[PDB]
Amino acid sequence: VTGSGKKPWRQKGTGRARSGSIKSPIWRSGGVTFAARPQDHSQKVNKKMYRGALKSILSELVRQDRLIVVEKFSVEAPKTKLLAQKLKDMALEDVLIITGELDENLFLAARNLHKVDVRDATGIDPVSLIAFDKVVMTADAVKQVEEMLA
Amino acid sequence: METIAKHRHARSSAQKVRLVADLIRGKKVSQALDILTYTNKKAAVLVKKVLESAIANAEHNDGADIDDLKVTKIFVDEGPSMKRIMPRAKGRADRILKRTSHITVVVSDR
């Protein structure tokens, strides 16, 4: 805290409490006994534990029929309307389009939509899988998920 | 009808004018005027000006015939005070309170 180490008043005889500096935590305008430091909150998670969790989440989604396997899911042109129409007829509003390979047309189409999110198999996290109401995979996406899970 | 009349930030202290307020509280305006006229305090003239204003508001903004008017509610409440530093002996310093008050006058016929 900006200031000086000067004692505001001598240490005896005064009819006031003993003070050492104006920067004391119990003094106005300067203090904070335990000031925060910039620290990282990242936690280690075992690879087997992380993989085991994904298997559990995938199993649960299948049981609760929140996971749907379909053939290739692509859009002829990079237009959001086409993606919106292709989902309305399917009656999907909060969906995660997990595709085997990232496609620019699909990526651009889903970028504006917030309830619709498109990702690759590599780019999957447990939080996103649970958060999204439905997940639709592709045959290739499922196959690559099988092998890398092992 | 209420015909209130306030004078805020009066020079005198709230206490000192309360003595004058008690003299005229509940009494008819006719006797109130002379009592304040012949009372030897500035609070007398300070309150008298407020009482005169209250009568004027009643006569002008409301029904006439000020003769049948009584001071129903007279009270004073201390207002903001000004802090002043005054030197004392041995180099010490004290704070002088230039106190003020708000005088409210309410006169009604009934």
Partner: peptide, 17 residues
């Protein structure tokens, strides 16, 4: 609203010795 800066030295006490 400055807090008193100069506090005088206390008056010497009566010798209780």
């Amino acid at each position: 609203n400055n807090r008193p800066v100069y506090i005088p030295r206390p008056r010497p006490p009566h010798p209780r010795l």
